[model samples]
Target: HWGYGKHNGPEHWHKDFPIAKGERQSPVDIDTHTAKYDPSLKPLSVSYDQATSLRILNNGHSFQVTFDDSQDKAVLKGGPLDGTYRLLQFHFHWGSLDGQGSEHTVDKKKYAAELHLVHWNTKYGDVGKAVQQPDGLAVLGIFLKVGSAKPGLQKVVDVLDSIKTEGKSADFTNFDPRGLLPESLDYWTYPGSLTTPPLAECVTWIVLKEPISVSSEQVLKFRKLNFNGEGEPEELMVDNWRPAQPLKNRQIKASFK
Candidate 1:
């Protein structure tokens, strides 16, 4: 379901599902000069907790890092955001080659990869069931590019050897995903839908404008993951991205206030 070949990827998803062409599709290029401000937009309250836990999950599709709702957590508040959103899972979307890989395109340009940090409104009781509801999800997108060197990327790469296969996961004890966030937390916010299937419209996206870097070797290691079954020669798992969609008349705003 992940790889639909080049022609059938996110670029073509809208052909079958007309809604895919909707204006709010994510990962749009955030150009402050061109983007207009909507004064009505407000900030969400996020009270950061100290004891958040991270875990890795092999869901037969991709290797995702999941965060638990610990006492030490960040609670979002006010504006169009009044619920508690817990970090759910985080994963990457890549390309076949080092030069190209990403789900959401920016002004027709594709980055090396895209990282999604998923969260669910805690008022829904459980994340498992909240995913099905239209207003139960919040997602943060971080764009990535490949370069000659990447010191920040190593934090994640250091643990890849353990969960190299399907259904195989390792304990990432004391892992803190916050360390992976870009230095700038100010982001572009919008009301959009889920990028994946069961494409729920309940997502409020916070996309960081700054892009992160990963070394060529680290990307190569990611490419070693298999889209095929285990024990087989690991197929290159690159090109796991979607394409940019139309923006319609929807507004994308940056946090200034």
Candidate 2:
């Protein structure tokens, strides 16, 4: 049902879905060379365990993973930062436009794909409503680049046939998104507006400098999937990414030794 045609792209998200423009966004590229040296920007820590419940939803444009927050824990405990935010859900945005299928961009180069790991401040009441709160979000951005061997991301890909249609829902019992994180939690932090329309400025973004690997063929496979579902023609969807916006006085700090 949600396909990017004519005015239905990121630039027009505000027009189509007025309130979405205010949500937190991810994947703003980091130029390590220009970022200021800051010890606070590093992950400081991370925590994970078997997620008690995991559910998947086909929300038009992409598949989102929702989970029970109380069971999981934050890996980081101390730093000049807000308290530990609990993991809520994770999702991604791909493109029918080839190597240009991510939600965030840097400078002008679009990566193969982008993944968002969503978390909400425990200080907030709950993730369901926390998502609507500006200060309640911390989005982790992972860039997927085209390569040779399959990136092992096929775990999710293997199940695509089951929920190939829009609005489809499925229960994935043993799946944990933490499997996709790069070995290093080192990241670059910044303050920016949402990448989407409502352009809400309530997020503290942590972008991983080290990217995970995905094959070029795998990238092509993502393009082959339908935006609405399998009934749609097998068109290559690769251009769903947005262009990099101006830094606009934002300060970036990297967590590196």
Candidate 3:
């Protein structure tokens, strides 16, 4: 299994998952000077239902909150998406310490942590089929800086203690992801891939320009969880974010001035 430990981290992923080195890879360093502002890009609309949240799972990669996507109860529309995309799940990536956790950076600056809300286009049928289409998946990236604590975010941190091992999950309901979003919907968008292996190259990345705030303690709590399973040797999960990938001639478009 691929992991963020030793030779299995992002660098070693290139061997098992060749797409890790593919064109249009995600989590690139956003160069504001070169990012062209596109008036054509519309404001992103996220209609999240508080009841759609199913549970939170520690998948050895990161802690992810899943949504009930049997139907289109919640979705992401507008922005650069061709059609509405169904909300699949939301997760986070962070470092063991402060000052460096975000996957995508701004002007080469890294945040303490990052949140990702993933959505899949229903046009291509089931999510499995969507992976092959270019416009299949839409991933919303939000950076988390250490500061004041977000009210809704505290619940997410509290649940970490229960799911300390890999594959551990707990029911997490009435959680609306909208509350975690920053006030501004302005973002930088581009074509990219899943940050994790398999590393499918079919995602439409929408990274917010403004970062949401989180308490320093909350970020450190994420480190309390284990990357190893129940029986395996103890391994603290840290630096779960992939290092910034090269832009490789690709350009990022901004929805703001």
Alpha-carbon local distance difference test for all models: 0.66, 0.62, 0.90
**Model 1: per-residue Cα lDDT over 1-257, one tens digit each:** 53445665566666666656665665455556655565665654444445254677554445687666643264544445556777766788877776677765555667888888777788787776776676677777787887655564666676766667667776654556665566666567777777755455668777766778777788877777766557866655567665555566667776653
Least well predicted 10-residue stretch by lDDT in candidate 3: 45-54
Error of 1 at 160 (Å): 1.8
Runs off by more than 4 Å, candidate 3: none
* Candidate 2, run of 10 with poorest lDDT: 72-81
Stretches of candidate 1 above 4 Å error? 6-8, 11-24, 27-32, 38-51, 70-80, 148-152
Better of 2 and 3 by lDDT: 3
lDDT value for candidate 1? 0.66
Alpha carbon lDDT of residue 86, candidate 2?
A: 74
Off-target runs (Cα >4 Å) in candidate 2 are: 1-3, 16-29, 73-80, 148-152, 229-238
- Local error of candidate 2 at residue 171 (angstroms): 1.6
Pairs that clash in candidate 3: none
lDDT per residue as tens, model 3, 1-257 = 78998878888998999988888888899999999999999999888863389999999999999998778888899998889899989999999877898999999999989999989998876678888888889999999998998887988898899999999999998887887999999999999999998889989999999999988888878989999889999999889999899899788999999
What does the lDDT read for residue 76 in candidate 3?
A: 91
- lDDT, ranked from best to worst: 3, 1, 2
List the candidates' TM-scores in order: 0.81, 0.81, 0.97
- Model 1 earns a TM-score of 0.81
